Design a protein around this ligand. Structure first.
Ligand SMILES: Cc1cc2nc3c(=O)[nH]c(=O)nc-3n(C[C@H](O)[C@H](O)[C@H](O)COP(=O)(O)O)c2cc1C
Ligand code: SF4
Ligand code: SF4
Ligand code: SF4
Ligand code: SF4
Ligand code: FES
Ligand code: FES
Ligand SMILES: [Mg+2]
Ligand SMILES: [Mg+2]
Ligand SMILES: [Mg+2]
Ligand SMILES: [Mg+2]
Ligand SMILES: [Mg+2]
Ligand SMILES: [Mg+2]
Lengths: 90, 226, 439, 156
């Protein structure tokens, strides 16, 4: 779950600056002024946009070293195929 | 029992190494392979401090703090430019092969390698070539295994085998392809294997029980319990 | 050809002409085991050690340390009655082939030298830590041990005096790091061949926690002649400050490669052109390494200095196994140094970071430089590796010597290294929405 | 499944009393087991560890440290050429090209049918004599790219 209290957010942009995966960004559009203040707490469903935002081609998991469904151990960016210790080569 | 660190003169136990004494005095020397319970081995080479003599030797020699006896007539300098540069280059060599995954590492804000990388003042990558990668093992239902993040400091093996007498964990391979894990996938037999999650300075061995419901160290709320 | 005589050629003198080994009968015939008999029935320990210290024998393995001091280091107390003497027959150095000759064609020489040295040291067992790729050498050594055992030269009561000295052979798997003095001990213990920190020296605590003196093959072959002919004779072979004879040779594309026994004061040019013949038919001299791979390159100007420890040590290089290699003009220096650094990097162990993690970086930089994909800051990164891998920064001496040919080739031939830098340094990949930090 | 033969177990037990510690016979036990089968199977690790008295982790560390204790299936006649400085100078590259052109493989692979593995070796300690190579236990020096076929035809 992702949850951001928009009754406290001052829109500083420090969050977007800290995100190492470019997931969270500040886009030019304002929140509707809610009626109850409870409805100003967004819970991922609201926040998750359909698109890549400002940075179009960056893929963190293409950089990471751990394996996911897409990439195996030696398929990251600037990485070598894993040499097994039981190899024959010296 | 009276060493000179960067001009200052301290009083230390002359029966322990210079890393132990300098850390007891409050000074800051980086070190990966020393542990105050597993003795000192000079493997990582990361606790280098310049050592002079005669109190007027202007050209000392780099030597590892954890391996020098810290005797009486000892003159060292943690902040020497050559010592600083060597300590920095030593972490740079470790960073040559590291995996770009701090965000997904089980231990961010809790990793000793991050501490020492920010401590040696290294924040620029000159390496350009590929990194070595490794396949993981299934070590049990307790601790995970990510050998991509290993810096080969030998703490796991030293603890697990020479300290806790484990008999089912060791080191394999050689020449920058070294490997630390079980001879085959399977659960770790030692009763005291959990301590590998904090003995290992990197995020190679991290417990699964916390990895399932994870939260960074800062977010945690502790209290002294038994 | 060379006229060998027991006076000037103590080692290579008995070697029969047809290259076949010299077995026990022919060896004893040519004054074999006379030195061992003299030492066992006319001397005592603490006297053979002093005879070896006064003769001035020095380590022939490459270190150059005095053998008499090495043996004196042993503790003097009869509470330690279990001591070991390990011969370092593991001869892995890209350029040394001198122990092959000795323990292939003269196994009894090494057997007798080891017997004398283990009597001097009060050691009850001796392990010939063999290479593994030496098949004929192992066969001959075991045959010589069996002959000397059957003939009384080995076993419980060796020729009257009470001295057992059982002698074994250990043909190991192929790793160059097991040649190290205190990694050989680990490998003999049956563990991973990782060096050990000194102090304690192997002399006080060595093989299995017992005392131990590790000696090369030629050093131990030197001893039988010292004892048999006298200490003064060995002292006076030639007027150099490194007493005795040495196996020197020139490798490479010379007209007659090999190794010979020389008076340890011979100029490197006297080996290249008088003995080895010189460069062959159209090749021109460019550089040379004195000793095995792991010693500094030297140009043609350094070809006239005498082959001894102090001279070549002051010339920048170091005399190792004294088996030179001649590199002719047609060899690119970057390709040669890459071929050396990839061996020194793949042949290492994993214990210390500077070696394990910095030698591969130099290998990759050299591959990029020889492919033509070098970048600014490469040679300045290689030079930083020659200072931070030097002696004291690494756990053992493998990297300090591994990075000697690199710096020594940079010094003399920087042009061939610069000629590879043909790229603009770039390391990032230009993420789209981020503006790069300029310079 | 793996179980130690009688000859190799007897040889290991005879080697175990050449030393003060049984562990010291680990490299020789691995070399015996490899001599019999050409490589060290995954069960041989635990078998040797049970014979000696040391754990399988130590035996597996010893076996994967040293380069001549094969832990992967290797053909017969494991060709090992030398590619070090003295040979690099004498032209071991032509020798490697003519070898991997005739075997139709790359360094580190078996051919097709389980003969003629191809490996590089550190140095064969026979430098003054041309580019060298070992086939199984025979050292072949003064190698020429012309004589690689006839020299390989001797091993069947
Ligand atoms: C990396 C390394 C490899 C070595 N390899 C050998 C070797 O292959 N053969 C050898 O005799 N000495 C070798 N040595 C030197 C030994 O450590 C030791 O000094 C020598 O074998 C015996 O000492 P001595 O020269 O006084 O006889 C090597 C040293 C190092 C650091
Ligand atoms: S911009 Fe982000 S970091 Fe700043 S107050 Fe708003 S949500 Fe919090
Ligand atoms: S081990 Fe430490 S430095 Fe390495 S990726 Fe994980 S958090 Fe980052
Ligand atoms: S696994 Fe962890 S403790 Fe073991 S060598 Fe690697 S970094 Fe050190
Ligand atoms: S320098 Fe360090 S890593 Fe290299 S062989 Fe010596 S101990 Fe091993
Ligand atoms: S902590 Fe001293 S060498 Fe690693
Ligand atoms: S370099 Fe090949 S035989 Fe020595
Ligand atoms: Mg203490
Ligand atoms: Mg995996
Ligand atoms: Mg897995
Ligand atoms: Mg493994
Ligand atoms: Mg950990
Ligand atoms: Mg000694």
């Amino acid at each position: 779950f992702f949850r951001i209290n928009f009754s406290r957010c001052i829109f500083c942009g420090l969050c977007e600056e800290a995100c190492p995966t470019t997931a969270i960004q500040l886009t030019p559009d304002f929140e509707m002024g809610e009626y109850k203040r409870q409805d100003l707490v967004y819970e991922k469903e609201d926040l998750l946009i359909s698109g890549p935002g400002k940075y179009p081609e960056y893929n963190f998991y293409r950089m990471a070293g751990m394996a996911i469904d897409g990439k195996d151990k030696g398929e990251a960016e600037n990485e070598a195929k894993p040499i097994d210790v039981k190899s024959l080569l010296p | 029992a009276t060493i000179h660190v960067d001009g200052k003169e301290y009083e230390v136990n002359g029966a322990d190494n210079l890393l132990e004494a300098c850390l007891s005095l409050g000074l800051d020397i980086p070190y990966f392979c020393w542990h105050p319970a597993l003795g000192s081995v000079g493997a990582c080479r990361q606790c280098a401090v310049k050592q002079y003599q005669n109190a007027e030797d202007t050209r000392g020699r780099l030597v590892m703090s954890c391996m020098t006896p810290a005797s009486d007539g000892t003159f060292i300098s943690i902040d020497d430019e050559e010592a600083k540069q060597f300590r920095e280059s030593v972490v740079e060599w470790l960073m040559t092969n590291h995996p770009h995954d701090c965000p997904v590492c089980e231990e961010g804000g809790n990793c000793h390698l991050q501490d020492m990388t920010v401590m040696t003042g290294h924040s620029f990558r000159r390496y350009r070539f590929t990194k070595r990668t490794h396949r993981n093992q299934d070590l049990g239902p307790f601790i995970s295994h990510e050998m991509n993040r290993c810096i080969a400091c030998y703490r796991c093996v030293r603890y697990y085998k020479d300290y806790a007498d484990g008999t089912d964990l060791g080191v394999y391979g050689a020449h920058d392809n070294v490997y630390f894990g079980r001879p085959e996938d399977g659960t770790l037999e030692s009763e005291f294997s959990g301590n590998l999650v904090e003995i290992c300075p990197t995020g190679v061995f991290t417990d699964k029980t916390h990895s399932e419901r994870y939260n960074r160290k800062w977010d945690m709320q502790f209290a002294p319990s038994i | 050809n060379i006229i060998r005589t027991p006076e000037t050629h103590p080692l290579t003198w008995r070697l029969r002409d047809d290259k076949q080994p010299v077995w026990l009968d022919e060896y004893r015939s040519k004054n074999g085991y006379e030195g061992a008999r003299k030492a066992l029935t006319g001397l005592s320990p603490d006297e053979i050690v002093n005879q070896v210290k006064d003769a001035g024998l020095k380590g022939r393995g490459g270190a150059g340390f005095s053998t008499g001091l090495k043996w004196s280091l042993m503790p003097k107390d009869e509470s330690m009655n279990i001591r070991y003497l390990l011969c370092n027959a593991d001869e892995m150095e890209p350029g040394t082939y001198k122990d092959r000759l000795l323990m292939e064609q003269l196994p009894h020489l090494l057997v007798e030298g080891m017997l004398i040295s283990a009597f001097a040291l009060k050691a009850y067992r001796g392990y010939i830590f063999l290479r593994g790729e030496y098949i004929e050498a192992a066969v001959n050594l075991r045959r010589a041990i069996a002959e000397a055992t059957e003939a009384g030269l080995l076993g419980k009561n060796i020729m009257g005096t009470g001295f057992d000295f059982e002698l074994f052979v250990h043909t190991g798997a192929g790793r160059y790091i097991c040649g190290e003095e205190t990694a050989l001990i680990n490998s003999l213990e049956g563990r991973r061949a990782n060096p050990r920190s000194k102090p304690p020296f192997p002399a006080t605590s060595g093989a299995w926690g017992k005392p131990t003196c590790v000696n090369n093959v030629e050093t131990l072959c030197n001893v039988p002649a010292i004892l048999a002919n006298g200490v003064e004779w060995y002292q006076n072979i030639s007027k150099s400050k490194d007493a005795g004879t040495k196996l020197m040779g020139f490798s490479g594309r010379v007209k007659n490669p090999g190794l010979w026994e020389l008076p340890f004061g011979t100029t490197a040019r006297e080996i290249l052109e008088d003995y080895a013949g010189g460069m062959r038919d159209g090749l021109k001299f460019k550089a040379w390494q004195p000793g095995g791979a792991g010693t500094d390159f030297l140009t043609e100007a350094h070809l006239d200095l005498p082959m001894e420890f102090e001279s070549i040590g002051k010339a920048g290089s170091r005399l190792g196994t004294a088996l030179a290699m001649a590199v002719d003009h047609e060899i690119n220096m970057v390709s040669l140094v890459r071929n050396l650094e990839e061996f020194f990097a793949r042949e290492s162990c994993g214990w210390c970071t500077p070696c394990r993690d910095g030698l591969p970086w130099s290998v990759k930089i050299l591959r990029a430089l020889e492919r033509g994909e070098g970048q600014p800051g490469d040679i300045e990164t290689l030079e930083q590796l020659c200072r931070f891998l030097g002696p004291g920064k690494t756990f053992c001496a493998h990297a300090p010597g591994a990075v000697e040919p690199l710096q020594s080739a940079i010094k003399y031939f920087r042009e061939e290294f610069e000629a590879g830098i043909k790229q603009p340094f770039s390391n990032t990949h230009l993420i789209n929405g981020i503006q790069p930090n300029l310079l | 499944a793996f179980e130690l033969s009688a000859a190799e177990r007897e040889a290991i037990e005879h080697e175990m009393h050449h030393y003060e510690d049984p562990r010291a016979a680990s490299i020789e036990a691995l070399k015996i087991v490899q001599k019999q089968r050409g490589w060290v199977p995954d069960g041989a690790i635990h078998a040797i560890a049970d014979v000696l008295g040391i754990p399988a982790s130590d035996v597996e560390g010893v076996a994967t440290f040293y380069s001549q204790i094969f832990r992967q299936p290797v053909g017969r006649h494991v060709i090992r050429y030398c590619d070090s400085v003295v040979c690099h100078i004498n032209g071991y590259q032509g020798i490697q090209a003519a070898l991997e052109k005739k075997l139709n493989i790359k360094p580190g692979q078996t051919t097709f049918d389980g003969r003629f593995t191809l490996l590089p070796t550190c140095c064969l300690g026979n430098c003054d004599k041309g580019p060298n190579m070992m086939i199984d236990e025979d050292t072949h020096a003064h190698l020429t790219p012309e004589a690689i076929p006839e020299l390989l035809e001797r091993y069947k």
